[PDB]
């Protein structure tokens, strides 16, 4: 009681500060820009060869190779330019949750319900691709094991703990704590100095890898956070909330600049990503169709279509020349 009141007072002060210095709104200030216009997205290639439903995918650095895994417990390295099985690595555990492609392109990592996302090599000296290091110390499952460089991998577990790992020793170097519920998705910043984590408690935390502490907090949703993507400029980011709504925040403002939602949709989001220019925002849904939102007018430019079942993952190339989506139907699609 002597501390709950203090917490309430501090929270009220923070809310008042957020409310202040909020003159006008994004929809009010950007309303004079022309609409992007209806888009004519269509499939320029499809990818087949999986054994079960797909969960996650990721683009390479060269924007030509992408890696994905499925519930079948296999990692497949494709080649969009000329559809080809570059590699096919099956994991020891048939379960998997995420995959990642090292910027150098010489390593990949993935994990599942076994609570250990291990490191996989691709530049084998002898000639055979073999697992390099298995990282143990996390209690829950892993919902993202994003790479940082050839020797550092950021990871977020299902046990409210995220930590940065040093691959060489295979031992945690720093531990992030503070999230109330389960952490689901994380994304790095262009300067690789900060990353954002969304957790299943209607809150996403901003951190600092070098120092290891929460710098800020954001709360604007009515349910858990399913996906999160960083704006290219590094001054904002979007989150995919299960409450059938996508919201955007700004670090400098410390608030929610504008939100996307409509009554037409009653399905929570599954995956979100940004276009290279930033005007287009790619939002997934549960109804097998992936919408495209005008990131600066709150409008919809025309949904995609032509996928069998729930879309699991999504992404865009580094150069932004293509978009890739995965679903539970074991198919992978690539769009113009």
């Amino acid at each position: 009681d002597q501390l709950r009141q203090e917490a309430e007072q501090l929270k009220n002060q923070i809310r008042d500060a957020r409310k202040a210095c909020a003159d006008a709104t994004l929809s009010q200030i950007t309303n004079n820009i022309d609409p992007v216009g209806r888009i004519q997205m269509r499939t320029r290639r499809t990818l087949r060869g999986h054994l079960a439903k797909i969960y996650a995918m990721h683009w390479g650095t060269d924007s030509r190779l992408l890696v994905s895994a499925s519930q079948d417990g296999k990692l497949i390295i494709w080649d969009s330019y000329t559809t080809n099985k570059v590699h096919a690595i099956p994991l020891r555990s048939s379960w998997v949750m995420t995959c990642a492609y090292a910027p150098s392109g010489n390593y990949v990592a993935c994990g599942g319900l076994d609570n250990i996302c291990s490191i996989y090599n691709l530049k084998t000296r002898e000639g055979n691709v073999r697992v390099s290091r298995e990282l143990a110390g996390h209690t829950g499952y892993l919902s993202c094991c994003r790479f940082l460089d050839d020797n550092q991998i950021v990871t977020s577990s299902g046990d409210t703990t995220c930590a940065l790992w040093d691959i060489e020793t295979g031992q945690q170097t720093t531990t992030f704590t503070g999230h109330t519920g389960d952490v689901m998705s994380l994304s790095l910043a262009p300067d690789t100095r900060l990353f954002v984590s969304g957790a299943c408690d209607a809150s996403a935390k901003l951190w600092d890898v070098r120092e290891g502490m929460c710098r800020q907090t954001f709360t604007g949703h009515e349910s858990d956070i399913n996906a999160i993507c960083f704006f290219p400029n590094g001054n904002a980011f979007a989150t995919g909330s299960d409450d059938a709504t996508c919201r955007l925040f700004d670090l400098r403002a410390d608030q929610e600049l504008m939100t996307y939602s409509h009554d037409n949709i009653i399905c929570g989001i599954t995956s979100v990503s940004f276009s290279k220019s930033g005007r287009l925002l790619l939002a997934g849904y549960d109804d097998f169709n992936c919408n495209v939102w005008d990131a600066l007018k709150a409008d919809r430019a025309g949904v995609l279509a032509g996928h069998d079942n729930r879309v699991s993952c999504l992404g865009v190339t580094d150069d932004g020349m293509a978009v890739a989506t995965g679903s539970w139907d074991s198919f992978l699609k690539i769009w113009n």
Partner: peptide, 11 residues
């Protein structure tokens, strides 16, 4: 001690 919780998913 009594609480009150809305279970996560709406609809």
């Amino acid at each position: 001690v009594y609480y009150c919780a809305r279970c996560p998913a709406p609809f």
